[PDB]
Amino acid sequence: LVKSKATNLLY
Amino acid sequence: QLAEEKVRDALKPPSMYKVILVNDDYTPMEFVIDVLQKFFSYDVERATQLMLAVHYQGKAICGVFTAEVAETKVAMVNKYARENEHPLLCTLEKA
């Protein structure tokens, strides 16, 4: 299956 | 006795079928979680584990059903998958 894009915590 | 033989002979186990999701390299993990919640009444935690089983083991069993109900689950899940333009395949095997 295809894993979703991780959503970055750090800016 | 005769009555007892009649009883024995009426105890053939039900024909039951596993409904199975098969892995593929295109269907989103989130979509499989959605499928398990929508059509099999899994809570999010259980859906997530089964989804991971699909991905890492190759396939997973969603539950076990009468033949009639199993064919109905397969039809629905595949329809939902195609209308969302995923190749996800739901199928059956006899338990």
mmCIF file of C-alpha atoms in Angstrom:
data_model
loop_
_atom_site.group_PDB
_atom_site.id
_atom_site.type_symbol
_atom_site.label_atom_id
_atom_site.label_comp_id
_atom_site.label_asym_id
_atom_site.label_seq_id
_atom_site.Cartn_x
_atom_site.Cartn_y
_atom_site.Cartn_z
ATOM 1 C CA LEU A 1 0.000 0.000 0.000
ATOM 2 C CA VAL A 2 1.093 3.640 -0.273
ATOM 3 C CA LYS A 3 2.062 5.483 2.901
ATOM 4 C CA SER A 4 0.834 9.054 3.330
ATOM 5 C CA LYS A 5 3.174 12.038 3.332
ATOM 6 C CA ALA A 6 4.431 12.817 6.814
ATOM 7 C CA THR A 7 3.447 16.272 8.031
ATOM 8 C CA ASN A 8 6.481 18.210 9.261
ATOM 9 C CA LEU A 9 6.380 19.501 12.815
ATOM 10 C CA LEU A 10 9.372 21.850 12.566
ATOM 11 C CA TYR A 11 9.456 25.180 10.735
ATOM 12 C CA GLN B 1 -31.303 -44.364 17.550
ATOM 13 C CA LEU B 2 -33.102 -43.418 14.325
ATOM 14 C CA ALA B 3 -33.892 -39.979 15.714
ATOM 15 C CA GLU B 4 -30.273 -39.589 16.773
ATOM 16 C CA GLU B 5 -29.003 -40.486 13.307
ATOM 17 C CA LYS B 6 -31.303 -37.856 11.846
ATOM 18 C CA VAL B 7 -29.797 -35.300 14.213
ATOM 19 C CA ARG B 8 -26.211 -36.205 13.297
ATOM 20 C CA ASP B 9 -26.943 -35.869 9.611
ATOM 21 C CA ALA B 10 -28.303 -32.352 9.991
ATOM 22 C CA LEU B 11 -25.106 -30.976 11.567
ATOM 23 C CA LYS B 12 -23.055 -30.239 8.448
ATOM 24 C CA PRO B 13 -21.068 -27.076 9.220
ATOM 25 C CA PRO B 14 -22.128 -23.833 7.440
ATOM 26 C CA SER B 15 -20.185 -22.912 4.299
ATOM 27 C CA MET B 16 -18.259 -19.863 5.500
ATOM 28 C CA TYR B 17 -15.914 -17.548 3.589
ATOM 29 C CA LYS B 18 -13.084 -15.289 4.624
ATOM 30 C CA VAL B 19 -13.288 -11.895 2.980
ATOM 31 C CA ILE B 20 -9.766 -10.782 2.177
ATOM 32 C CA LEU B 21 -8.066 -7.551 1.106
ATOM 33 C CA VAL B 22 -5.036 -8.065 -1.137
ATOM 34 C CA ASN B 23 -2.006 -5.758 -1.139
ATOM 35 C CA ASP B 24 -1.012 -3.620 -4.088
ATOM 36 C CA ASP B 25 1.527 -0.833 -4.592
ATOM 37 C CA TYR B 26 -0.993 1.957 -5.468
ATOM 38 C CA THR B 27 -3.849 2.044 -2.944
ATOM 39 C CA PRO B 28 -3.314 4.520 -0.109
ATOM 40 C CA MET B 29 -2.984 3.105 3.411
ATOM 41 C CA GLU B 30 -5.555 5.646 4.565
ATOM 42 C CA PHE B 31 -8.044 4.343 1.986
ATOM 43 C CA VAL B 32 -7.745 0.817 3.323
ATOM 44 C CA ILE B 33 -8.399 2.110 6.825
ATOM 45 C CA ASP B 34 -11.479 3.850 5.444
ATOM 46 C CA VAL B 35 -12.648 0.599 3.795
ATOM 47 C CA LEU B 36 -12.340 -1.398 7.002
ATOM 48 C CA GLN B 37 -14.237 1.228 8.998
ATOM 49 C CA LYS B 38 -17.006 1.775 6.411
ATOM 50 C CA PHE B 39 -17.784 -1.812 5.377
ATOM 51 C CA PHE B 40 -16.632 -3.942 8.302
ATOM 52 C CA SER B 41 -17.342 -1.725 11.333
ATOM 53 C CA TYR B 42 -13.750 -1.761 12.609
ATOM 54 C CA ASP B 43 -12.692 0.965 15.036
ATOM 55 C CA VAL B 44 -9.759 3.075 13.854
ATOM 56 C CA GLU B 45 -7.184 1.161 15.879
ATOM 57 C CA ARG B 46 -8.204 -2.287 14.615
ATOM 58 C CA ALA B 47 -8.532 -0.965 11.040
ATOM 59 C CA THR B 48 -5.010 0.398 11.207
ATOM 60 C CA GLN B 49 -3.542 -2.961 12.330
ATOM 61 C CA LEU B 50 -5.353 -4.902 9.621
ATOM 62 C CA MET B 51 -4.231 -2.351 7.053
ATOM 63 C CA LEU B 52 -0.645 -2.867 8.195
ATOM 64 C CA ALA B 53 -1.176 -6.617 7.846
ATOM 65 C CA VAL B 54 -2.312 -6.080 4.247
ATOM 66 C CA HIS B 55 0.810 -4.015 3.514
ATOM 67 C CA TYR B 56 3.418 -6.160 5.301
ATOM 68 C CA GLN B 57 1.926 -9.663 5.044
ATOM 69 C CA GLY B 58 0.497 -9.405 1.521
ATOM 70 C CA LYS B 59 -3.174 -9.778 2.429
ATOM 71 C CA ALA B 60 -5.451 -9.759 5.466
ATOM 72 C CA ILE B 61 -8.738 -11.373 6.475
ATOM 73 C CA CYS B 62 -11.457 -8.779 7.184
ATOM 74 C CA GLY B 63 -13.841 -11.255 8.770
ATOM 75 C CA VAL B 64 -15.684 -14.520 8.055
ATOM 76 C CA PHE B 65 -19.201 -14.587 6.632
ATOM 77 C CA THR B 66 -21.860 -16.748 5.021
ATOM 78 C CA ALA B 67 -21.255 -17.141 1.298
ATOM 79 C CA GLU B 68 -24.141 -14.801 0.476
ATOM 80 C CA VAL B 69 -22.940 -12.040 2.774
ATOM 81 C CA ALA B 70 -19.308 -12.517 1.741
ATOM 82 C CA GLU B 71 -20.131 -12.008 -1.960
ATOM 83 C CA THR B 72 -21.999 -8.847 -0.964
ATOM 84 C CA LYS B 73 -18.978 -7.468 0.950
ATOM 85 C CA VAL B 74 -16.650 -8.210 -1.943
ATOM 86 C CA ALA B 75 -18.947 -6.505 -4.438
ATOM 87 C CA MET B 76 -19.293 -3.377 -2.245
ATOM 88 C CA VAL B 77 -15.619 -2.996 -1.333
ATOM 89 C CA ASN B 78 -14.426 -3.372 -4.922
ATOM 90 C CA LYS B 79 -17.048 -0.879 -6.134
ATOM 91 C CA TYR B 80 -15.971 1.631 -3.524
ATOM 92 C CA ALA B 81 -12.308 1.041 -4.514
ATOM 93 C CA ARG B 82 -12.921 1.519 -8.269
ATOM 94 C CA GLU B 83 -15.065 4.598 -7.904
ATOM 95 C CA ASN B 84 -12.093 6.119 -6.015
ATOM 96 C CA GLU B 85 -9.795 4.951 -8.809
ATOM 97 C CA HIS B 86 -7.772 2.490 -6.714
ATOM 98 C CA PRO B 87 -6.877 -1.130 -7.765
ATOM 99 C CA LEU B 88 -7.552 -2.520 -4.286
ATOM 100 C CA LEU B 89 -8.873 -6.042 -4.632
ATOM 101 C CA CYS B 90 -11.243 -7.611 -2.164
ATOM 102 C CA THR B 91 -11.830 -11.332 -2.664
ATOM 103 C CA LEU B 92 -13.006 -14.500 -0.899
ATOM 104 C CA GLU B 93 -11.732 -17.863 0.192
ATOM 105 C CA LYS B 94 -13.631 -20.641 1.899
ATOM 106 C CA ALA B 95 -12.835 -20.900 5.607
#
